[PDB]
């Protein structure tokens, strides 16, 4: 149901300033207008703010080299294309950059995997015999490629050359304990109810 009038702009239409009582945007016809001009872009206008962040309030495309998307952990600042009212695709930050509070790396211009593969390793799940075995679940561990027996914590004599006494802690929302749990803010693996 792609209803015209919703604040979001869907296909078919091009601007959704809304109903007349709230359509402050002059670039767009009101949603309660005749169907010939049903949420259509006003004549002699270049863009509307509802189309994207690269439009001026005076219905003109924001010039090129104008910022539209902020810098992220794996994304550089987006500049307006000067030809479209939407922020174009941001150029990705370089591979393996420290991401997700240094728990992960910048892969494919996004934040996935873990820091283990930054050092040429792969991530793994540790396990303790007795005591506070929960804490280890929220502690990042790494393994050699296809060698599960090499699994060890980041902050250990093993992987010391890579992490140098850094017991990296998982971020809240990251799964743990072989997906059985999800790590919480208190650094306690938690989930899989019952």
């Amino acid at each position, epitope marked *: 149901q792609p209803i015209c009038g919703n604040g979001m702009v869907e296909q078919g239409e091009e601007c959704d300033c809304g109903y007349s009582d709230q359509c402050k945007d002059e670039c767009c016809y009101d949603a309660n207008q005749p169907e010939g001009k049903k949420c259509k872009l006003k004549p002699g206008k270049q863009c509307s703010p509802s189309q994207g962040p690269c439009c001026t309030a005076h219905c003109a495309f924001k010039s090129k080299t104008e910022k539209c998307r902020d810098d992220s952990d794996c994304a550089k600042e987006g500049i307006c294309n000067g030809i479209t009212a939407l922020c174009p695709a941001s150029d990705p930050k370089p591979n393996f950059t420290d991401c997700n509070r240094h728990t992960q790396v910048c892969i494919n211009g996004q934040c996935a995997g873990s820091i283990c593969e930054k050092h040429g390793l792969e991530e793994c799940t540790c396990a303790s015999s007795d005591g*506070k075995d929960d804490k280890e679940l929220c502690h990042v561990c790494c393994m050699k490629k296809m060698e599960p027996s090499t699994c060890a914590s980041t902050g250990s004599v093993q992987w010391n050359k890579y992490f140098l006494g850094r017991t990296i802690t998982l971020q809240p929302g990251s799964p743990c304990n072989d997906f059985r749990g*999800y790590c*919480d803010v*208190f650094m*306690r693996c*938690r*989930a899989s*109810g*019952s």
Partner: antibody
Amino acid sequence: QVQLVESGGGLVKPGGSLRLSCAASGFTFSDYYMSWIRQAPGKGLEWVSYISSSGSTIYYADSVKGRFTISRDNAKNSLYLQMNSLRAEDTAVYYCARDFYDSKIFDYWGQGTLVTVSS
Amino acid sequence: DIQMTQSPSSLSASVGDRVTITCRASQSISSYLNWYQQKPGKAPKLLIYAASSLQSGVPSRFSGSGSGTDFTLTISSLQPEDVGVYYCMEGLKTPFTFGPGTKLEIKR
């Protein structure tokens, strides 16, 4: 069954300190995390502390840190919550709870105990 | 700072009326959210552990729902014993935050 009984709580002068105990009649008290949540007389619930089964993990709230000293004795099946330097905003009913193997967050609760900081 | 809103706060409805309570979250809180019911003088009781999960012994009319920043508790058929104050508490991104509290009376 599960039944938690809380004792203590009363009229404490401003400042000072008070002791609070939770007795957990039936469950494997050494296999479950414990916690305290309080509610003022006319407000909502508010978490206080979260305690691991054998110590080694004792969290508090930013509004009580430096004032609340919590402890437990798995052998005696008791949960102590000592509180120091009580202010007028500590007048509330304190509830004992069990923060399960971090699942079904607080499967059971106690009836609580009122704390009055009036002079 | 995670902000927990609960709408509505006050609510009066008759027996059998369908009831919906929404817990609004400032950010994308996790699905480890549980709904609790409290009656005055007594203590709160678990209603719905995580997103859409019924606790054993709880009446089976309740049904949870929601994702992202919006969670929802649905009472299919309101009943005389459903009068009370309802709270939403999230998890895993949560210093055990409790919603403002939806009061619920009954109409007769």
